[PDB]
């Protein structure tokens, strides 16, 4: 028979293809169920039983089906403040069911608040020092009332929690900072402000299991945004410097199997680490195929370790 | 020479009295700043600097003092859905600042969602088995749509996340269950349902550092009306059975310095563990002054361990 693997990812990636013919536990096959978070639901019980509901719109028809996954690979962001982007209830349900997964449900749950993740990077920065781990300066404001404490301009202000550049604004002077603070008051959430780096290059160091890759590219908008995919991220040599950055970040929340550190190299000759991404990190460059391959092997390795 | 201890607790408990005359690191005095979450704010920086602001109502009706705590003791619930009960942003800010505390900020943060905490007890249940850890049967519904499948009545349905039992309702037939399911829909949150236990008595096993106490409250209220006043409560002898329950629960989220497990003993002569409380647990019984003294020693021990 087979072990069921639930993969939460968009339809543009066909994970069933990646796991074809692949066996675990010696003789078991893997049946892949794939869906986006918006199409999933579940119920879980303290006694160990649970069932996942999937309503998939396929080739012209509202499809329904139920199943009991044995493992889960999560490739989609589970949070976000925009409309219909909050799936924390599903992450809690999977942990309640005791589902093993990549990344671990513990880590995914803790990646919900970006400044909470950044707090783990600040502790690493204190342990290793800036020479080895150049964390960007950043200020955390619990709400709008503390934004009377001004940062040095220009800064990039990031409001609440959200991906794909959502909620990030570049602020160049006090007057516009005051206006942004009044907007943070409306949203009733927290915000962060970090210096806007006049950047030379963007850098991403990724770790998938035991595989590492570093990519760099000319930076057009630094740590503010990525503007209209002008330059593709190109792989460069892995250095011992870069490896330490991602190995150190990968230890948080019990360990991240898939993660990436983003940094900018400024025209001032310095590196500034400003973000860590987990298993929902998009795949980039000419190696998506190969990276999906590495993720597939990682998943098989884990199902063999944890399942029975 | 003094270290500042921020204690987040209501005004009736005068923690400054518990710490008067106590020293840390040999010759430093302890300066206690006490306030409730609603009167506090802060700003934190990745470079390590941070500051807390407390709204005072002494000579000015709207006083405002600032300080830099070295350690924090949290005795108030930091979450909750009622009017101005949500302080997750301050918890995040204290962790961003790297503030040591009791209980740990990591554990406090993870106690925000009751079913997430319960998910840890389900894992303990699988490990130890029911003879040793009699976890109550419970079902987790990520949202109202999974509540179509009806449970066996009567049940206690817990809606969303709030303490003091807020949001708990006893449901006896599917008509009322359907109305509660519509309230869950209205609140856009999750819910849990567990059998309503016809109870002989209540049991609470607490652990403060390495001190343990077991208390029994007799009533039929069972797992429906909890936390409420104790017009009738009494201590009892600890047993290896009870100690294992709280010790196993105290290991979650990196370790809980202060916690308690609640259970009801059924008229059927069986125990049902249904809740774990962390450092915001109310102090009960006649030994409340002894308990505060135990919490005070724990805080001094920890400050000596983590400060310089």
Q: Which of residues 91-110 of A touch B (CB under 8 A)?
A: 92-93, 95-96, 98, 109-110
Q: Which residues of chain B are within 8 Å of residue A38 when distances are taken between CB atoms?
A: none
Tell if the CB–CB gap between B126 and A42 is shorter than 8 Å: no
CA-closest candidate to residue B144, choices B114, B188, B100, B78: B188
Helix/strand/coil (H, E, C) string of chain A? CEEEEEEECCCCCCHHHHHCCCEECCCEEEEEEEECHHHEEEEEECCCCEEEEEEEEECCEEEEEEECCCEEEECCCCCCCCCCCCCHHHHHHHHHCCCCEECCHHHHHHCCCHHHHHHHHHHHHHHHCCCCCCECCCEEECCHHHHHCCCCCCEEEEECCCCCCCCEEEECCHHHHHHHHHHHHHHCCCEEEEECCCEEEEEEEEEECCEEEEEEEECCCCCCCCCCCCCCCEEECCCHHHHHHHHHHCCHHHCCCEEEEEEEEECCCCEEEEEEECCCCCCCHHHHHHHHHHHHHHHHHHHHHHCC
Q: Which residues of chain B are within 8 Å of residue A48 when distances are taken between CB atoms?
A: 122, 126
Q: Please report the domains of chain B, with CATH numbers, ordered by start residue.
A: 1-103+283-295 (3.40.50.20), 104-136+197-282 (3.30.470.20), 137-196 (3.30.1490.20)
- Determine the Cα angle at A66 with ends A63 and A69, to 5°: 125
Pair of tokens at residue A68: 């009991």
Interface mutation target, options B105, B140, B254, B273, chain A, most CBs of A under 10 Å: B140
Confirm or reject contact between A88 and chain B (CB < 8 A). Answer: yes
Q: What DSSP letter does each residue of A210-275 carry, written as one string?
A: TEEEEEEEE-SSTTT---TT-S--EEE---HHHHHHHHHHTTGGG--SEEEEEEEEETTS-EEEEE
Residue B208 · residue B258 · CB < 8 Å: yes
Distance (Å, whole) CA A74 – CA A7: 6
Distance (Å, whole) CA A291 – CA A213: 10
Q: Which residues of chain B are within 8 Å of residue A113 when distances are taken between CB atoms?
A: 88, 92
- Beta bridge partners, B218, equal B201
Q: Which residues of chain B are within 8 Å of residue A92 when distances are taken between CB atoms?
A: 113, 115-116, 119, 140, 142, 190
Categorise residue A255: left if φ over 0, alpha if ψ from -120 to 50, beta otherwise.
left
Q: Which of A47, A89, A110 sits opposite B190 (nearest CB)?
A: A89
Q: Would you tell me the crossing angle of helices B88-96 and A114-128 to the nearest 10 degrees?
A: 20
Q: Which residues of chain A are within 8 Å of residue B48 when distances are taken between CB atoms?
A: 122, 126
Confirm or reject contact between A55 and chain B (CB < 8 A). Answer: no
Residue B108 · residue B78 · CB < 8 Å: yes
Residue B87 · residue B37 · CB < 8 Å: yes
Question: What are the angstrom distances between the C-alpha of B262 and each of A193, B135, B245?
Answer: 43, 10, 10
Residue A43 · residue B140 · CB < 8 Å: yes
Beta-strand relationship, B40-45 and A271-277: unpaired
Interface mutation target, options A142, A143, A145, A195, chain B, most CBs of B under 10 Å: A142
Confirm or reject contact between B146 and chain A (CB < 8 A). Answer: yes
Interface mutation target, options A37, A40, A44, A184, chain B, most CBs of B under 10 Å: A44
Cα distance from B237 to chain A (closest Cα, Å)?
29
Cα distance from B289 to chain A (closest Cα, Å)?
34
Count of residues for chain A? Answer: 308
Q: Which residues of chain A are within 8 Å of residue B116 when distances are taken between CB atoms?
A: 92, 95-96, 109
- In a 3-state reduction of DSSP, which class is residue B226? coil
Q: Which residues of chain A are within 8 Å of residue B190 when distances are taken between CB atoms?
A: 89, 92-93
- Beta bridge partners, B65, equal B54
Residue that has been written with the tokens 């593709």 in this structure? A232
CA of B143: which chain A residue's CA is closest? A89
Q: Which residues of chain B are within 8 Å of residue A124 when distances are taken between CB atoms?
A: none
Confirm or reject contact between B136 and chain A (CB < 8 A). Answer: yes
Element (H, E) at A159: strand A155-159
Q: Which of residues 197-236 of A touch B (CB under 8 A)?
A: none
Tell if the CB–CB gap between A89 and B44 is shorter than 8 Å: no
Residue B221 · residue B231 · CB < 8 Å: no
Q: Which residues of chain A are within 8 Å of residue B146 when distances are taken between CB atoms?
A: 41-43, 53
Beta-strand relationship, B2-8 and B28-35: parallel
Distance (Å, whole) CA B253 – CA B9: 22
Pair of tokens at residue B157: 């349905």
Q: Which of A98, A126, A190 sits opposite B48 (nearest CB)?
A: A126
Burial of B204 (0-12, 13-18, 19+ CB in 10 A): buried
Q: Which of B46, B89, B115 sits opposite A96 (nearest CB)?
A: B115
CA of A120: which chain B residue's CA is closest? B96
Pair of tokens at residue B111: 């106690």
Categorise residue A25: left if φ over 0, alpha if ψ from -120 to 50, beta otherwise.
left
Tell if the CB–CB gap between B92 and A135 is shorter than 8 Å: no
CA-closest candidate to residue A118, choices A102, A135, A132, A96: A135
Interface mutation target, options A53, A105, A140, chain B, most CBs of B under 10 Å: A140
Distance (Å, whole) CA B272 – CA B262: 9
CA of B88: which chain A residue's CA is closest? A142
CA of A141: which chain B residue's CA is closest? B43
Tell if the CB–CB gap between A138 and B46 is shorter than 8 Å: yes
């Amino acid at each position: 028979k087979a072990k069921v693997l639930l993969v939460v990812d968009e339809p543009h990636t066909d994970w069933a293809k990646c796991f074809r013919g692949k066996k675990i536990l010696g003789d078991y096959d893997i049946k892949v169920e794939q869906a986006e978070f918006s199409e999933l639901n579940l119920v879980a019980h303290a006694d160990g039983t649970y069932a996942v509901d999937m309503q998939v719109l396929r080739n012209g028809t509202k499809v329904v089906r139920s199943f009991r996954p044995d493992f889960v690979l999560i490739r989609q962001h589970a949070f976000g403040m925009a409309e219909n982007e909050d799936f924390r209830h599903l992450v809690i349900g999977m942990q309640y069911a005791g589902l093993p997964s990549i990344n671990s449900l513990e880590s995914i749950y803790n990646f919900c608040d970006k400044p909470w993740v950044f707090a783990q990077m600040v502790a690493i920065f204190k342990t290793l020092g800036g020479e080895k781990f150049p964390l960007i300066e950043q200020t955390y404001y619990p709400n709008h009332r503390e934004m009377l404490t001004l940062p040095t301009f220009p800064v990039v202000v990031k409001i609440g929690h959200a991906h794909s550049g959502m909620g990030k604004v570049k602020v160049e002077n006090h007057y516009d900072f005051q206006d942004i603070a009044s907007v943070v008051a409306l949203t009733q959430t927290y915000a962060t402000a970090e210096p806007f780096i006049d950047a030379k290059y963007d850098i991403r160091v990724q770790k998938i299991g035991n595989n590492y890759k570093a990519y760099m590219r000319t930076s057009i908008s630094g740590n503010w945004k990525t503007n209209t995919g002008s330059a593709m991220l190109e792989q460069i040599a892995m250095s011992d410097r870069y490896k330490l950055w991602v190995d150190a970040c990968s230890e948080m929340f019990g360990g991240l199997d898939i993660c990436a550190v983003k940094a900018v190299h400024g025209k001032d000759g310095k590196d500034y680490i400003f973000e860590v991404m987990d298993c929902s990190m998009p795949l980039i460059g000419e190696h998506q195929v190969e990276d999906r391959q590495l993720i597939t092997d990682l998943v098989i390795s884990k199902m063999n370790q944890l399942l029975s």
